[PDB]
Design an enzyme around this catalytic site. Structure first.
Site, PDB file in Angstrom:
ATOM      1  N   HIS A 103       0.805  -1.214   0.000  1.00  0.00           N
ATOM      2  CA  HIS A 103       0.000   0.000   0.000  1.00  0.00           C
ATOM      3  C   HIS A 103       0.842   1.270   0.000  1.00  0.00           C
ATOM      4  CE1 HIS A 103      -3.617   2.228   0.208  1.00  0.00           C
ATOM      5  NE2 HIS A 103      -3.566   2.542   1.490  1.00  0.00           N
ATOM      6  N   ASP A 159      16.416  11.313  -7.743  1.00  0.00           N
ATOM      7  CA  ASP A 159      17.861  11.410  -7.521  1.00  0.00           C
ATOM      8  C   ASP A 159      18.258  11.039  -6.096  1.00  0.00           C
ATOM      9  OD1 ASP A 159      18.557  12.076 -10.136  1.00  0.00           O
ATOM     10  OD2 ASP A 159      18.276  14.224  -9.789  1.00  0.00           O
ATOM     11  N   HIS A 205      -9.249   9.735   1.925  1.00  0.00           N
ATOM     12  CA  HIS A 205      -8.142   8.806   1.765  1.00  0.00           C
ATOM     13  C   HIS A 205      -6.883   9.282   2.478  1.00  0.00           C
ATOM     14  CE1 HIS A 205      -6.353   5.275   0.238  1.00  0.00           C
ATOM     15  NE2 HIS A 205      -5.667   5.812  -0.755  1.00  0.00           N
ATOM     16  N   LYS A 239      -4.097   9.997   5.365  1.00  0.00           N
ATOM     17  CA  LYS A 239      -3.537   9.288   6.517  1.00  0.00           C
ATOM     18  C   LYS A 239      -2.618  10.275   7.234  1.00  0.00           C
ATOM     19  CE  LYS A 239      -3.342   6.594   3.424  1.00  0.00           C
ATOM     20  NZ  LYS A 239      -3.995   6.386   2.103  1.00  0.00           N
ATOM     21  N   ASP A 250      -0.809  18.633  18.971  1.00  0.00           N
ATOM     22  CA  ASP A 250      -0.390  19.829  19.701  1.00  0.00           C
ATOM     23  C   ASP A 250       0.144  20.929  18.790  1.00  0.00           C
ATOM     24  OD1 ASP A 250      -1.076  18.335  21.945  1.00  0.00           O
ATOM     25  OD2 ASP A 250       0.990  17.688  22.304  1.00  0.00           O
TER      26      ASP A 250
END
Ligand SMILES: C[C@@H]1CN(C(=O)[C@H](C)N2CCC(n3c(=O)[nH]c4ccccc43)CC2)C[C@@H](C)N1
Length: 571
Positions: free
Chosen positions: A123, A130, A404, A406, A411
């Site tokens: 996933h 480079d 989608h 993540k 804080d």
């Protein structure tokens, strides 16, 4: 091993820049590919060779396949590893991607993995230039990922092309899945009748040593897969080796690379993402903004993100300190299926596990928070999702914005951005190979925390303010103050907006999932009523003017009155 049992140490003085939605991410990726000199490494769960990186499209100069071919004609070696689906039902069609990319140029070497039969996948989303510039996150170079703050539901109208999504790029995933990927420039749904599904995801570009560490991860995977097959063992796929011989405008932070790998995906076992998540949650002091595709926790389930969230909330309650937890999940899982009939099989399983994590059962966050503090849980946690509305075919239409992303924000000083969902397959490391970066701020900026002066990190504060402004209606409500994310006034405004928007959307579109359908029979009789959007479109349009932002409360009571396949595939 380094901190969080990671193969890479923290890298101070790292130039990192975040991206929200796919437009800027793809723009930066294209610009970096144009400036590539020697090598480009690409890691994807689904790659579309014919995707356009910059829109609107007036030429082929910014198509992924064309750009890769042109750079390979300059002497650049393009190493790509792809994921091979267990069954062709998963419409990624890795074979076509491999064949097209290979046919582009000899310098484009593409390999696929796994070859044997297993329940697990790759996933990770990674693009290294480079070994100096690394883009990662949840954004594949695939159809439908491109989007912007507008989250447009319509595209109706090559040098004079006004389409932002061409052919297979325009798609409503839940309505109909991709078919016949070998013909890219051909629509499989009707733009005049079926609205598109907005895409929301968060990525990040890192410059310097963290990019080198991501390149090292890619090199380890490439050499492991090379010594895992017969056709891949030929010198036609040469060995890759790292190098440490040591730029869009970004921010100076400290970035540490984290990954979830196992002996099947890589050569070693690592679960640094889970350790980083748990440490960030445990050490969080003011708030936790979580935006993830899947929320499967609260050990069937083994990861303990939800347990740490509950412990932190309980400790904040007992110590009497202000503490807010913002959770944003998509309203329905990313699969084709009719929600009117109650959904599919994968959708039902994912919803069941998510509800078990959140409210259903005795291990759920809500049950423990209730048994500890009565109804005060509403002041510490807030689970929501995204939905937008527009005009199509003479009537108002609505669709959820698929989350989608993540990303975890702590804080206004720490940010985890990755490809690993909050589920057992992505966090345990044993199942799926995932990539993520932990970004901590060394440069601060004045802001507010519970009405007090707070030196919030620039990167995290910028990301959180952008997320709040997009989720809310800041461009239409300039009076709203987004500086204090934990104070009582802002949390009350957030919850009020979420509840009001959910009520308005249910009243106008009678959309699903919703809390008005608690049983399958009530759901069946509920879909028989024609929504007001198609009855009196002027009245629904007038009512929809009270919608501010895209934030809507999550339906925790949807369908609440309800052995050779393991249950760990949907966890
Ligand atoms: C492929 C096409 C386009 N599709 C998507 O891109 C949707 C949005 N999926 C949802 C599931 C996601 N996923 C995850 O998180 N872990 C996974 C492990 C294995 C497989 C998928 C996994 C990846 C993105 C929908 C699909 C039915 N047909």
């Amino acid at each position: 091993l380094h901190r969080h049992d990671s193969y890479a140490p923290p890298r101070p003085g790292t130039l990192a820049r975040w991206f929200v939605n796919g437009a800027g991410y793809f723009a930066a990726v294209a610009d970096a590919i144009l400036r590539a000199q020697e090598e480009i490494f690409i890691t994807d769960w689904w790659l579309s060779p014919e995707v356009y990186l910059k829109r609107p499209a007036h030429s082929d100069d910014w198509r992924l396949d064309i750009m890769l071919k042109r750079k390979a004609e300059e002497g650049v070696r393009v190493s790509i590893l792809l994921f091979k689906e267990v069954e062709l039902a998963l419409g990624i069609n890795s074979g076509y991607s491999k064949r097209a990319l290979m046919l582009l140029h000899p310098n484009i070497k593409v390999m696929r993995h796994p070859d044997q039969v297993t329940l697990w996948a790759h996933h990770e989303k990674l693009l290294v230039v480079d070994q100096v510039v690394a883009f990662l996150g949840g954004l594949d170079l695939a159809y439908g990922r491109w989007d912007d703050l507008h989250y447009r539901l319509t595209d109706l109208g090559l040098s004079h092309n006004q389409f932002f999504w061409l052919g297979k790029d325009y798609s409503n995933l839940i309505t109909k899945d991709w078919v016949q990927l070998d013909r890219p420039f051909e629509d499989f749904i009707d733009r005049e009748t079926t609205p598109r599904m907005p895409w929301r995801d968060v990525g990040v570009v890192v410059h310097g040593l963290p990019a080198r560490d991501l390149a090292r991860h890619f090199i380890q995977r490439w050499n492991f897969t090379k010594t895992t097959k017969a056709k891949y063992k030929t010198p036609t796929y040469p060995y890759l080796l790292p190098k440490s011989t040591s730029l869009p405008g970004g921010q100076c932070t400290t970035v540490q690379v984290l990954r979830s790998v196992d002996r099947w995906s890589a050569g070693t076992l690592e679960n640094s993402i889970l350790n980083a998540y748990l440490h960030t949650i445990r050490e969080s002091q003011h708030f936790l903004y979580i935006e993830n595709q899947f929320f499967i926790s609260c050990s069937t389930v083994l990861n303990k993100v939800g347990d740490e969230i509950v412990d932190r909330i309980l400790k904040a309650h007992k110590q009497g300190w202000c503490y807010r937890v913002y959770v944003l999940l998509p309203l329905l899982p990313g699969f084709e299926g009719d929600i009117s009939t109650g959904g599919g099989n994968s959708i039902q399983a994912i919803l069941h596990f998510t509800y078990r994590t959140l409210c259903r059962g005795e291990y759920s966050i809500l049950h423990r928070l209730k048994a500890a503090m009565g109804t005060a849980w509403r002041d510490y946690i807030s689970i929501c999702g995204l939905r937008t509305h527009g005009e199509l075919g003479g009537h108002p239409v609505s669709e959820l914005i698929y989350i989608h992303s993540k990303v975890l924000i702590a804080d206004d000083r720490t940010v985890i951005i990755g490809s690993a969902n909050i589920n057992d397959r992505s966090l345990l490391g044993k199942r799926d190979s995932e990539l993520a970066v932990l970004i901590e701020d060394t440069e601060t900026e004045p802001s507010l925390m519970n009405g007090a002066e707070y030196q919030a990190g620039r990167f995290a504060l910028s990301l959180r303010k952008h997320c709040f402004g997009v989720i809310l209606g800041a461009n239409t409500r300039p009076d709203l103050d987004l500086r204090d994310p934990i104070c009582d006034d802002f949390f009350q405004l957030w919850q009020d907006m979420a509840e009001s928007n959910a009520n308005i959307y249910e009243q106008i579109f009678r959309c699903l999932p919703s809390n008005a359908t608690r049983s399958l029979r009530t759901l069946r009789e509920y879909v028989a009523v024609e929504p007001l959007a198609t009855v009196s479109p002027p009245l629904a349009r007038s009512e929809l003017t009270q919608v501010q932002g895209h934030l809507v409360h999550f339906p925790l009571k949807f369908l609440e009155d309800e052995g050779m396949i393991p249950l760990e595939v949907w966890t």
